Homo-oligomer: 157 residues x 6
């Protein structure tokens, strides 16, 4: 079989993320979404919420699973018995950094990284920006999954 890992901190998962999950799932036999715990105490949602939110946003993709990532992405990829990372590109991606890590990741573990541009309508949303805009009262509900909108409403109220 063929497999890819979609790594990230998904705090929260946006519809740009989901778009990329959907494309990974159509093109690989299995997809694993690896949720990577923020280095220090820094999140808006705790791990369980992030997992639930990804899970709840991906029920339509039966070949995808959600797991917490630990250590080097490449080590996790290898443990999933895979050799591919799939990363989404959006407006504001630091692509040069992504490239530097792609080359490093290939160097140290032979893992390939495939990049895919997210749909234009979801290309300007990031977890960071969605949070900052929502905290100051802006409406980003069209760019997040409903499971995320539900949890974002509660935590704001």
């Amino acid at each position: 079989m063929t497999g890819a890992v979609c790594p990230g901190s998904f705090d929260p998962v946006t519809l740009g993320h989901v778009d990329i999950f959907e494309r990974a799932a159509a093109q690989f036999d299995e997809v694993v979404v690896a949720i990577l715990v923020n280095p220090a105490k820094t999140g808006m949602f705790d791990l369980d919420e992030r997992i639930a939110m990804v899970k709840e946003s991906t029920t339509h993709l039966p070949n995808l699973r959600v797991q917490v990532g630990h250590g080097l992405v490449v080590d996790f990829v290898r443990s999933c018995g895979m050799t591919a990372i799939v990363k989404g590109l959006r407006t504001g991606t630091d692509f040069e950094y992504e490239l530097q890590m792609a080359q490093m990741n290939k160097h140290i573990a032979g893992v390939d990284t495939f990049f895919v541009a997210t749909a234009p309508r979801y290309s300007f949303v990031s977890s960071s920006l969605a949070k900052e805009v929502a905290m100051l009262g802006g409406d980003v509900s069209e760019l997040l999954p409903e499971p995320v909108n539900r949890r974002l409403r509660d935590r704001l109220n």
Copy 2:
């Protein structure tokens, strides 16, 4: 009438900023410079000084006013009864980030953002770099307005 907002933290306003103010004022009936209070306690000049400095540097532009910005830029723009942001581009601008925010700002409030490249002679000055260079004794007086040079001299001595 037609109107644009030039948002920023102007800590301090440079002559790159002024160049952009000047171009906004020539092309729109009214210009509002929105000074956006640094999120946490982080400035070099307090709000009043920043306002004074912008005011003192823009006496030649009668169709421009200076106001403190609050909340989402787009909310402020709408409150000024305008629908346009004018942002300057210089060497070192994170243009991809600017673009991501431009698309988000259009999405949530229908506000357009116009980008204009600052004059080559003012294209390498930023508030950040002007401060760091001046603190370590370098001469950046040719890239800042005289009202700013006056206040930068005092605070360094």
Copy 3:
């Protein structure tokens, strides 16, 4: 009054173009779309068709007019009694070239150029690509105005 020129060869005008026309018209008192005749004998549509197509695609914008451009863009801008160019940015824009021409245009004639990112859904269409995709049988009708789709159908059949 305030005014901007939207220059280009509009062979054919796409909905990315129109998006930009719409934004120019909302923010300036008058907009002039300047159709710039291809240097040598190189178009798909002749000048009259290009004019008709822009005209037919902009009936909802009463403050915009369509004129054939001649010579230096800046000379045309000045002749329209304006001092601003408005250019759209899309995926694939040579922005560095646009910037070089913006600085040159300011140098030689004091004309400012404002850049505005086109809507994400129209950000991957260009006249060039729309033509190449349509010639080889692909459907680009969602990214062109109906006046353009009508004329593109006929010329393909």
Copy 4:
């Protein structure tokens, strides 16, 4: 099964190309290299030579086949019963153009495009540059497959 198409004009196939073929073949059940005939009469090697050269350079990859591409890449991809393009990124790739075509290709046919950075040691070779450097007597043999070096020697002598 899962499948990807690696499109291009491979005139000639370089070791940057092969690097990408190798990565596609490891991650997808079948890979098809689509050789796309230059629009007008413009090649250095004719189609048969290009096919032979790709074939001869990919004998170690049993899950890959070489076919001549016709029309829209996306139409060929669909005909191969696949929905993925795999493209290599190297120094000098026009990535903005690649992105514009990726979004267009997704729009018109639902085909995803995955981008993968070629190995650093093969990242500065292109068919174009390899030809220009070799014609003027430079040694690019370390950056081309041996089947290509053999045919490039003969045609130069």
Copy 5:
């Protein structure tokens, strides 16, 4: 001694070029400006004029000489008994292409390429753009050396 080559087609040499020549001459014992004959019959000035123009624009730099380049830049560099190329960066430079050629040039001949940003006031001039703007009547005399302005006047009249 230390040495660098400044390669190009200098049709015509601009003041951006001269700025770079000046910086090369201050930092290396000898500088050679290599004028590289356009591949086909394509120039505005013939070789002799280009040489004269560079010569006449560099009389203040006694450690610089002007020579016609032939073949691979790296072959010329080696023949000058040097191992360094100095290239200017301006607005509109295709830097990715410059980088690809820098890596190729190092690969095939061990020649290093140093890049230096041209002065902001000369950063938007190119030979190409200066010619196109001047042909259509624009004034680019502030961005070209006087020897070039003299010859550009005559050829336009």
Copy 6:
């Protein structure tokens, strides 16, 4: 004589750094590596270790010396009686920032900055990434000098 300064925090010096040192030393009479103490208490290796590591990694370059930098880079350059900075470019370099500082540095002190792309095989290593990858158990020993690998082993154990 001719001279260049290679500034940085070299925490630790990588083989990308050394590649650049080597190229500077071949092209300039003297090279000074300026180690610039991290602003606050933030390093992995203290100054003495950084100096030792650079020293131990550059014994093959007799025309290079290592010194601790203080204040503005340009002030240090001037004190070394030089007027040139040599900076390496790798994947992930913030080149726009480098350019902004190059223009500022030229403005305030007349110091030129030359940029040189590091060898492809060392183009994805940075001090930052090498540390993060090594802390989480990855093998980056092929991208660091042996003096650095020795000290990185000890500090990890």
